[PDB]
Design an enzyme around this catalytic site. Structure first.
Site, PDB file in Angstrom:
ATOM      1  N   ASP A   1       0.940  -1.322  -0.126  1.00  0.00           N
ATOM      2  CA  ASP A   1      -0.088  -0.125  -0.080  1.00  0.00           C
ATOM      3  C   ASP A   1       0.866   1.175  -0.025  1.00  0.00           C
ATOM      4  OD1 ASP A   1      -2.063  -1.968   0.375  1.00  0.00           O
ATOM      5  OD2 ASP A   1      -1.888  -1.659   2.381  1.00  0.00           O
TER       6      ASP A   1
ATOM      7  N   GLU B   1      -7.920  -4.797  -1.994  1.00  0.00           N
ATOM      8  CA  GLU B   1      -7.025  -3.965  -1.407  1.00  0.00           C
ATOM      9  C   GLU B   1      -7.207  -2.612  -0.815  1.00  0.00           C
ATOM     10  OE1 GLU B   1      -3.935  -4.087  -0.519  1.00  0.00           O
ATOM     11  OE2 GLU B   1      -3.009  -5.921  -1.609  1.00  0.00           O
ATOM     12  N   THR B   2      -7.059  -2.645   0.253  1.00  0.00           N
ATOM     13  CA  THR B   2      -7.554  -1.098   0.880  1.00  0.00           C
ATOM     14  C   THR B   2      -5.953  -0.744   1.690  1.00  0.00           C
ATOM     15  OG1 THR B   2      -8.643   0.013   2.650  1.00  0.00           O
ATOM     16  CG2 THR B   2      -8.232  -2.060   3.266  1.00  0.00           C
TER      17      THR B   2
ATOM     18  N   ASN C   1      -3.749  -0.287   4.493  1.00  0.00           N
ATOM     19  CA  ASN C   1      -3.753  -0.921   5.870  1.00  0.00           C
ATOM     20  C   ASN C   1      -2.474  -1.684   6.347  1.00  0.00           C
ATOM     21  OD1 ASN C   1      -3.985  -3.028   4.146  1.00  0.00           O
ATOM     22  ND2 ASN C   1      -5.766  -4.177   5.074  1.00  0.00           N
TER      23      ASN C   1
ATOM     24  N   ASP D   1      -6.578  -7.963  -0.629  1.00  0.00           N
ATOM     25  CA  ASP D   1      -5.622  -7.349   0.215  1.00  0.00           C
ATOM     26  C   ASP D   1      -4.779  -8.313   0.756  1.00  0.00           C
ATOM     27  OD1 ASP D   1      -4.934  -6.369   3.114  1.00  0.00           O
ATOM     28  OD2 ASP D   1      -5.704  -4.851   1.747  1.00  0.00           O
TER      29      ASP D   1
ATOM     30  N   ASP E   1     -21.749  -0.946  -1.227  1.00  0.00           N
ATOM     31  CA  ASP E   1     -21.644   0.121  -0.382  1.00  0.00           C
ATOM     32  C   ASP E   1     -21.878   1.614  -1.157  1.00  0.00           C
ATOM     33  OD1 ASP E   1     -20.349   1.503   2.211  1.00  0.00           O
ATOM     34  OD2 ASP E   1     -19.583   2.437   0.962  1.00  0.00           O
TER      35      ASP E   1
ATOM     36  N   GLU F   1     -27.160  -0.951  -0.430  1.00  0.00           N
ATOM     37  CA  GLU F   1     -27.321  -0.183   0.802  1.00  0.00           C
ATOM     38  C   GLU F   1     -27.687   1.062  -0.109  1.00  0.00           C
ATOM     39  OE1 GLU F   1     -23.621   1.816   2.307  1.00  0.00           O
ATOM     40  OE2 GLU F   1     -24.625   1.903   4.503  1.00  0.00           O
TER      41      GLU F   1
ATOM     42  N   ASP G   1     -21.812  -0.569  10.669  1.00  0.00           N
ATOM     43  CA  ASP G   1     -22.299   1.086  11.010  1.00  0.00           C
ATOM     44  C   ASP G   1     -22.976   1.049  12.336  1.00  0.00           C
ATOM     45  OD1 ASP G   1     -21.103   1.870   8.540  1.00  0.00           O
ATOM     46  OD2 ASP G   1     -22.723   0.831   7.688  1.00  0.00           O
TER      47      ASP G   1
END
Ligand SMILES: [Ca+2]
EC number: 3.2.1.68
Length: 750
Positions: free
Chosen positions: A128, A229-230, A232, A259, A375, A435, A510
C-alpha cells in the site's frame, strides 16, 4: 459486454510474452516501468506503449527481455503518463518539472509523469502507499510543494500473475430466501482465535478454517467487509494507537486485488490462490461468500482541500485519466461528491463502468464469490457525468447527482444486464444487495432499486429499535411493526419485488452491535485504546440500556431485549443479516463507528461467559428454527389466508386497532401447511412496558399451541429457546398467556 477492451497484464499461453494494455483517452505518452521488487528499487526496464485504438495503449514484452533486464522472479509493473497539462519534454527525467503546464487543465486532466501509476487492472498489489517503510503520503501528491517528487520506489506496483489452478469449489444454488447472512471482517474473524494456528490467525486461510464454526451456528452465507486492497499496511507502525489505522477498509486502492495484509501467503500470487482456497472451504461447507464492494469512491479521494484545486493524491486512476474515472465539478477543477470521501467514481462513464463490471466478473468467476453488497449503492444509480449538464447525460438536466433507476445506462442497470441474478426459486446466479443511500441530492432510495436488487432495510432496523427503546419518547406505530414482520411490502411490493428482497437486520458494522443497542444510552466514541477514539457515526442509534443506569433495569433485561431483537430479524419474512459476534453478545462498549480500530476490542473473541454461551445457544436454536420452518420464509407476500393479525384479546386486529397509536402489542398466526410448513406458528410482541395477557386464537393447523420461546427475564438461561420436541404445551383456543413487557413469545401448533 465483460472485458470489452481486454485490459491488464497477462502472459501468453506458453509464458513467452506478457502483453500490457491500459486505457487513457487523454494521455499523450504512456511508458511501462518494470521492477524486481515492489518497494525501494528503481526500475530494471522501461517500454513505451503504443495506441491500439479506442483509447487503449499496448505493448508486448518477451519474457527473455525481462530476464535479461535482471527480473527473473515475479514481474512488478507500473506506468508513467503524460498529457495536455504536462506534455512530454525530451529533457524530462524522474523528479523533473520539464514539460509542466498545470496540475489540472480546463478539461480536468491531472497527468504527472513523476508519479508511478498502478494499473487499475492489476490482479495483485505489492504494498500500500503507506506501509512500515514509508508513512509519508506526500510523495504521491501534486501541487507546488510535491509535484516533482518521483514516487517510483515508494508507489504500489501491480504483479503480473500466472493463472491460478486453485479450485473455488461448487457454488451453492440455494434461493436467497433460505439464507441467513453473517457479516464479519476477515481479519477480526480469527485474529485472536486460539483455536486456529497462530500463523493463520486473521487471514483468508484462517477464515476458511472457521467454516465449521459457521456451520454449527447455522448461518448459510458469510459477508465480508471489503477484501479488495485497502490502505492498511501501516496500521501497526505506531503501537497502542488507532491514529493511523483503517480497519473496515472502505478505501479501495484496486478493484481486482485481494488485500495482501489479510493473506497468510504474502508472496506474488499468494493472496489470490489463498482467497480461492478459502471460498472452496466455505463452498464445501455449503456456505455462500458475499463481498462488500465499494465502487462509489476510490482511495485516491478528491482534492486535499476544497479551496485548492492543485493538490490531490495520484497513484492510479487519476494519473491515467482523471476525467474518465472521477465525477468532476462544473469547470472540471474540483470533484463532485455524494460519498463524503472527496469524489464520486464516475459510475455513468462507460469506461469507468466497464471497470466495475469487469472487476465484478473477476471476483464472481475467477474468485468464486456468490454475491455482492454494494456500499452507498445510490451512487451507482447516478445519471450525471459532471457537475454541469451535458447532453451525453440527458437524464441529468441539472448536472451533479440524480438517481434514475429508469435510465438503462446507470451502473445498477448495467450490472443487471451483464449478469444473471439468482431466480427466486434458486439455481445459479448472483445475489445482489444494495445499501440504498448515499449523501445529498435524491440519493436516499430505500425501495427505489430495480427488480433484481435486494436492499438493506434501514426502516426495519430503526422502527424496531424505536419500538423497544423509545417507548414514551416518540410515537411507535403498531402498523410499522406489522410491516417489518411481514417483509415490508410498503417498500418492496410496488416494484414487483418480494419479501426476501428486504435485508432485515437490527445491527451492522455501522453503528452499535446487538448487545450495544440495548446496553448504551448513547455512543461513546472517545475512549482510549483499544476502544477508541473514533470520529462519530450516526447521532440516531435509538439505543437504551433498559434502565440499567436509572436503577430500573439490570443485565437480564439487556439480554431480554437482545433476545427480542434477534428474534425479530430471525422470525420476520425477508432475508436476515446478523453481525458476527452477536451470537455471544459482542460489545464495543458503545463505540458506534469503530472503523479505525484494528485492535483486540474490535476482533472477535471466543472465550465467553456463561451468559454469553447461553445467548449463543438461543441464537443457534433460533436460526435452526427459521431454517426448519418455511412459513417464515415465504417466496411471495403472505396472502390473506396465510397470515392473520391478532389483537391481544384474541380478536382479529381491525382498523380501530391499527389506527390506535396507543396500541403497542401485536400478534400474528401463519398457516404453516399453506406455506409447506409442518406446524402453524404464532408470534406475539408485547411492545408495552408492562405485562400483557394474550388470548390464543384457534391454531390454523393442529389442535394446540406449544411454547418454543419466551424472551422474558424469568426464562433467561441455557434453555430459553427449547430444543425441538421439548416445546411446552400451553393450550388451544382461548388459553391465555401472560407476556412480560417488551418481549416476544414464539409458539407452534401440534
Ligand atoms: Ca492493503
Amino acid at each position: 459486454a465483460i472485458n470489452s477492451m481486454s485490459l491488464g497484464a497477462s502472459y501468453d499461453a506458453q509464458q513467452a510474452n506478457i502483453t500490457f494494455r491500459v486505457y487513457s483517452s487523454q494521455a499523450t505518452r504512456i511508458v511501462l516501468y518494470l521492477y524486481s521488487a515492489g518497494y525501494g528499487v528503481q526500475e530494471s526496464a522501461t517500454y513505451t506503449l503504443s495506441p491500439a485504438g479506442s483509447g487503449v495503449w499496448a505493448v508486448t514484452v518477451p519474457v527473455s527481455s525481462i530476464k535479461a533486464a535482471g527480473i527473473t522472479g515475479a514481474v512488478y509493473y507500473g506506468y508513467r503518463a503524460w498529457g495536455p497539462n504536462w506534455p512530454y519534454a525530451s529533457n524530462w527525467g524522474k523528479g523533473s518539472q520539464a514539460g509542466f503546464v498545470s496540475d489540472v487543465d480546463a478539461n480536468g486532466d491531472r497527468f504527472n509523469p513523476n508519479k508511478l501509476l498502478l494499473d487499475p487492472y492489476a490482479q495483485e498489489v505489492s504494498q500500500d502507499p503507506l506501509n512500515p517503510s514509508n508513512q509519508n503520503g506526500n510523495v504521491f501528491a501534486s501541487g507546488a510543494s510535491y509535484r516533482t517528487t518521483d514516487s517510483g520506489i515508494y508507489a504500489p506496483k501491480g504483479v503480473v500473475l500466472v493463472p491460478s489452478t486453485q479450485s473455488t469449489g461448487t457454488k451453492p444454488t440455494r434461493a436467497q430466501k433460505d439464507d441467513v447472512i453473517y457479516e464479519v471482517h476477515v481479519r477480526g474473524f480469527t485474529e485472536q482465535d486460539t483455536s486456529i494456528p497462530a500463523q493463520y490467525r486473521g487471514t483468508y486461510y484462517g477464515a476458511g478454517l472457521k467454516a465449521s464454526y459457521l456451520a454449527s451456528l447455522g448461518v448459510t452465507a458469510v459477508e465480508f467487509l471489503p477484501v479488495q486492497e485497502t490502505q492498511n499496511d501501516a496500521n501497526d507502525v505506531v503501537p497502542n494507537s488507532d491514529a493511523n489505522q483503517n480497519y473496515w477498509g472502505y478505501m479501495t486502492e484496486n478493484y481486482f486485488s485481494p488485500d495482501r495484509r489479510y493473506a497468510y501467503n504474502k508472496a506474488a500470487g499468494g493472496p489470490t490462490a489463498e482467497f480461492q482456497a478459502m471460498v472452496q472451504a466455505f463452498h464445501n461447507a455449503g456456505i455462500k461468500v458475499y463481498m462488500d464492494v465499494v465502487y462509489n469512491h476510490t482511495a485516491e479521494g478528491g482534492t486535499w482541500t476544497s479551496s485548492d484545486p492543485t493538490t490531490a493524491t495520484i497513484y492510479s486512476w487519476r494519473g491515467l485519466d482523471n476525467a474518465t474515472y472521477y465525477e468532476l465539478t462544473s469547470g472540471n477543477q474540483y470533484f463532485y461528491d455524494n460519498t463524503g470521501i472527496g469524489a464520486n467514481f464516475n459510475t455513468y462513464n462507460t469506461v469507468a463502468q466497464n471497470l466495475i463490471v469487469d472487476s465484478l466478473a473477476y471476483w464472481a468467476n475467477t474468485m468464486g464469490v456468490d454475491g455482492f453488497r454494494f456500499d452507498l449503492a445510490s451512487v451507482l444509480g447516478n445519471s450525471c457525468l459532471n457537475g454541469a449538464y451535458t447532453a451525453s447525460a440527458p437524464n441529468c438536466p441539472n448536472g451533479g447527482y440524480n438517481f434514475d433507476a429508469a435510465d438503462s445506462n446507470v451502473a445498477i442497470n448495467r450490472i443487471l444486464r451483464e449478469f444473471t441474478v439468482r431466480p427466486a426459486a434458486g439455481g445459479s446466479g448472483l445475489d445482489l444487495f444494495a445499501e440504498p443511500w448515499a449523501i445529498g441530492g435524491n440519493s436516499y432510495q430505500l425501495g427505489g432499486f430495480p427488480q433484481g436488487w435486494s436492499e438493506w432495510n434501514g426502516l426495519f432496523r430503526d422502527s424496531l429499535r424505536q419500538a423497544q427503546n423509545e417507548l414514551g419518547s416518540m410515537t411507535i406505530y403498531v402498523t410499522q411493526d406489522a410491516n417489518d414482520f411481514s417483509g415490508s411490502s410498503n417498500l418492496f411490493q410496488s416494484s414487483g419485488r418480494s419479501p426476501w428482497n428486504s435485508i432485515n437486520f437490527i445491527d451492522v458494522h455501522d453503528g452499535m452491535t446487538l448487545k450495544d443497542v440495548y446496553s448504551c444510552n448513547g455512543a461513546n466514541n472517545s475512549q482510549a485504546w483499544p476502544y477508541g477514539p473514533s470520529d462519530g457515526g450516526t447521532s440516531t442509534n435509538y439505543s437504551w440500556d433498559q434502565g440499567m443506569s436509572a436503577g430500573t433495569g439490570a443485565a437480564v433485561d439487556q439480554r431480554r431485549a437482545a433476545r427480542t431483537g434477534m428474534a425479530f430479524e430471525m422470525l420476520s419474512a425477508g432475508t436476515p443479516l446478523m453481525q458476527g459476534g452477536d451470537e455471544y453478545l459482542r460489545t464495543l462498549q458503545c463505540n458506534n463507528n469503530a472503523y479505525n480500530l484494528d485492535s483486540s476490542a474490535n476482533w472477535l473473541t471466543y472465550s465467553w461467559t456463561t451468559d454469553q454461551s447461553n445467548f449463543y445457544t438461543f441464537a443457534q436454536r433460533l436460526i435452526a428454527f427459521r431454517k426448519a420452518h418455511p412459513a417464515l420464509r415465504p417466496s411471495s407476500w403472505y396472502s390473506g389466508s396465510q397470515l392473520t393479525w391478532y389483537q391481544p384479546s384474541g380478536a382479529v386486529a381491525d382498523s380501530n386497532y391499527w389506527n390506535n397509536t396507543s396500541n403497542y402489542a401485536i400478534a400474528y398466526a401463519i398457516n404453516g401447511p399453506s406455506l409447506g410448513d409442518s406446524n402453524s406458528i404464532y408470534v406475539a410482541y408485547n411492545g408495552w412496558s408492562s405485562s400483557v395477557t394474550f388470548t390464543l386464537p384457534a391454531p390454523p393447523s393442529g389442535t394446540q399451541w406449544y411454547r418454543v420461546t419466551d424472551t422474558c427475564d424469568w426464562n433467561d438461561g441455557a434453555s430459553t429457546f427449547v430444543a425441538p420436541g421439548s416445546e411446552t404445551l400451553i393450550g388451544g383456543a382461548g388459553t391465555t398467556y401472560g407476556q412480560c413487557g417488551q418481549s416476544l413469545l414464539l409458539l407452534i401448533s401440534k
